[PDB]
Structures are given as structure tokens and as C-alpha cells.
Design a protein around this ligand. Structure first.
Ligand code: CXE
Ligand code: CXE
Ligand code: CXE
Ligand code: CXE
Ligand code: ZN
Ligand code: ZN
Ligand code: ZN
Ligand code: ZN
Ligand code: ZN
Length: 296
């Protein structure tokens, strides 16, 4: 079992030079995904299978000078937030297959609490608040249905497991809908943990599926291409200007490079991430997540 806290930020702090070297500086100049908070619990029903629960809030933002304007700007994403909770099954079907199946309920809109959380954060640090929260994406309550399958060929070399994990993912519902395909490569001291990967709404955000006690470590790099049918954060209508602000791009790539290091019962993770332009007038953006996972 693992209990995890994960924080995502486009401001990568001491990891900014690494993020910039990896994905280039223009991606850091964008601000599309501005904050994430996630708390999750995974329980092993067997050595092969987990059931996970989580609650999370993700906050999305216009970029650059648009952040300070009174309302949403045509051509850039509006302020929005996605507040969600759900359950997921994560299982090794065999030594060569991992699958995941999950359902969220949530909301994108003022009810997701993005203005409240960001305004609070800003007040606490003495930053000014961004007024265009008044023109945020309007409420839509909904569900996500999520699935992933991954092949898991890996070989063990002197206690180091190295693997290649081609995967297909799918999300549906009235908030987000896409079909993704990708692969991750990983090296680490645990076969099960090495195959436990994911992108986008299938990202594990700190949750760990592992057999290992004592030292745990993993280093990984992956990309997933998704074909996007829906993204309500982009296609929804703003509260006051009543517009859809952008034309979504139907093909979106997500890159993730990261690592975990831990010792029973605590592990630390960092993931350096890039998402390619999600709309015609946007551009690629980079961010990190840092996770603390108690695993026992
Ligand atoms: C008992 C039933 C058996 C079920 C079999 C299920 C197998 C499913 C596994 C499918 O995985 C294949 C997916 O392959 C995708 C790999 O593609 C990677 C390319 O990613 C695009 C990267 O974009 C970057 C472009 O520069
Ligand atoms: C098998 C998965 C792929 C693993 C590749 C991971 C390589 C990681 C290299 C990390 O090096 C860290 C260097 O630290 C300095 C970074 O700062 C860059 C500019 O300053
Ligand atoms: C096909 C195996 C998957 C490895 C791909 C991982 C790529 C991550 C490297 C990120 O490079 C910067 C983005 O380049 C575009
Ligand atoms: C695959 C993950 C690699 C992460 C490398 C990050 C290097 C951190 C550099 C921080 O330096 C502080 C001075
Ligand atoms: Zn357990
Ligand atoms: Zn720049
Ligand atoms: Zn931010
Ligand atoms: Zn448990
Ligand atoms: Zn969720």
C-alpha cells in the first residue's frame, strides 16, 4: 500500500534549470497548467492488484501578459479548475501485461474552487490576484472513465531491472475524451514498480505499486501521443464574456522524465513534464510534479 501527496507547479523552483535544459525556455514561459494538488491511497488486494482512491484539484491559466487582464482573452485559455475524486483498479494481468480501469466524478467551473485556492496562495505570498478569474470557464459536472493497457517486457541485469512499456490509454465522458498511445522506458530495482507508468489523466501522481522493501529506485523517460476529442477546460464557455476562447489541437504529445528514490517507508519522486500545444494559438508548456509517497 501507498499513501501519496503530489504537488504540480509550472514554477519548478530549484528544478527550473533542469526543466529548461530538457524542454527549452519557451515552454517555461507558458503557464497553461499552473497548479496541481493530489492526495491518494493505494491498497494491494493481492501482490498483483491495487485499488486506489484519490482527491485532486488542478488549475489552468492564460499565459504571460494575459494573466493580468480583466477578462479571458480570445486566443488563449481562460482561467479554469478541475476538482475530482475517483477510484481505480491497477493490475498485472500477467508478467507481460499491466492494465488499469478507473472512474472519476468531478467538476470544471467556479465550483472546482480555482479562484479561491489561487487567490489564497497569492495573498499569503503577497502576490496580486488575477482578476480574470471572474471570467473563468462555467460549471460542468461530470465523470471520466479511464483505461490503460501496457505490455511489460523487461530484463534483469545484476539486480537492475530495465524495461520498455508500450501502452494504449483511453478517457471518455463529458469533461475529457481522448485515445492515447505511447511508451515509457525505465530502469530500477523493482520489476513491478518499473511498469507502473502513465500520462495525462492516467498519470500515477505519486501512487506506487511495488513489491520492494528497503531501497527503492526508478528512473524513467516516456512520451504519449493523444488524439483529443474533448477538453472542457478549452471548449467550455466563459462566465462573463460567454465565449469559447480557443480552437483545440486534436493531436497532443506528453513527455515525462523523472525518478523515484526511497527507503521503506518513504519515497520521493520528481517528474519533468512537457505537454505540446493544446490549441492552435497556444504553445508547448512545461511543468514539474514532486511527490512524497509512504509505502508499506
Ligand atoms: C489476453 C488479451 C491480450 C491483450 C493484448 C493487449 C496488448 C495491448 C498493448 C498495446 O500497446 C501498443 C501501443 O504501441 C504504441 C507505441 O507507440 C509509441 C509512439 O509514441 C508517439 C510519440 O510521439 C512523439 C513523436 O515524436
Ligand atoms: C532509462 C530512462 C532514461 C534515463 C535518463 C535520465 C538521465 C538523467 C540525467 C540527470 O542529470 C542531472 C544533471 O544535473 C544538472 C542539471 O542541470 C542542467 C543545466 O543546469
Ligand atoms: C520510444 C521510447 C520512449 C522514450 C521517449 C522519451 C522522450 C523524453 C525526452 C524529452 O525530450 C524533449 C522533448 O523532445 C520533443
Ligand atoms: C530524471 C530526473 C533528473 C532530475 C535532475 C534534476 C537535477 C537537480 C539539480 C538541482 O540543483 C540544485 C543546485
Ligand atoms: Zn499494502
Ligand atoms: Zn523564454
Ligand atoms: Zn502556476
Ligand atoms: Zn493497504
Ligand atoms: Zn481524478
Amino acid at each position: 500500500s501507498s499513501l501519496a501527496i503530489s504537488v504540480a507547479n509550472d514554477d519548478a523552483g530549484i528544478f527550473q534549470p533542469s526543466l529548461n535544459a530538457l524542454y527549452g525556455h519557451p515552454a517555461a514561459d507558458r503557464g497553461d497548467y499552473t497548479a496541481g494538488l493530489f492526495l491518494g491511497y493505494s491498497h494491494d488486494l493481492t501482490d498483483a492488484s491495487q485499488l486506489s482512491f484519490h482527491i485532486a484539484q488542478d488549475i489552468y491559466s492564460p499565459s504571460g501578459a494575459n494573466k493580468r487582464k480583466p477578462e479571458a482573452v480570445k486566443g488563449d485559455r481562460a482561467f479554469s479548475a478541475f476538482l475530482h475524486t475517483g477510484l481505480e483498479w491497477n493490475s498485472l494481468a500477467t508478467n507481460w501485461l499491466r492494465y488499469r480501469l478507473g472512474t472519476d466524478i468531478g467538476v470544471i467551473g467556479p465550483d472546482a474552487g480555482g479562484q479561491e485556492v489561487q487567490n489564497r496562495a497569492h495573498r499569503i505570498i503577497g502576490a496580486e490576484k488575477y482578476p480574470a478569474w471572474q471570467d473563468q470557464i462555467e460549471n460542468r459536472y461530470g465523470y471520466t472513465a479511464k483505461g490503460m493497457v501496457s505490455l511489460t517486457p523487461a530484463i534483469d541485469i545484476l539486480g537492475v531491472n530495465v524495461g520498455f512499456y508500450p501502452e494504449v490509454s483511453a478517457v471518455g465522458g463529458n469533461l475529457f475524451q481522448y485515445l492515447g498511445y505511447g511508451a515509457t522506458v525505465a530502469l530500477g530495482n523493482d520489476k513491478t514498480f518499473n511498469s507502473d507508468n502513465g500520462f495525462g489523466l492516467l498519470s500515477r501522481r505519486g501512487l506506487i505499486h511495488t513489491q520492494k522493501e528497503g531501497l527503492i529506485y526508478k528512473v524513467f523517460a516516456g512520451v504519449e501521443r493523444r488524439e483529443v476529442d474533448k477538453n472542457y477546460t478549452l471548449q467550455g464557455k466563459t462566465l462573463q464574456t460567454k465565449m469559447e476562447t480557443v480552437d483545440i489541437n486534436k493531436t497532443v504529445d506528453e513527455y515525462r522524465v523523472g525518478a523515484t528514490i526511497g527507503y521503506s517507508p518513504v519515497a520521493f519522486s520528481l517528474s519533468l513534464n512537457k505537454v505540446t500545444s493544446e490549441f492552435r494559438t497556444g504553445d508547448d508548456y512545461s511543468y514539474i510534479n514532486g511527490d512524497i509517497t509512504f509505502f508499506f
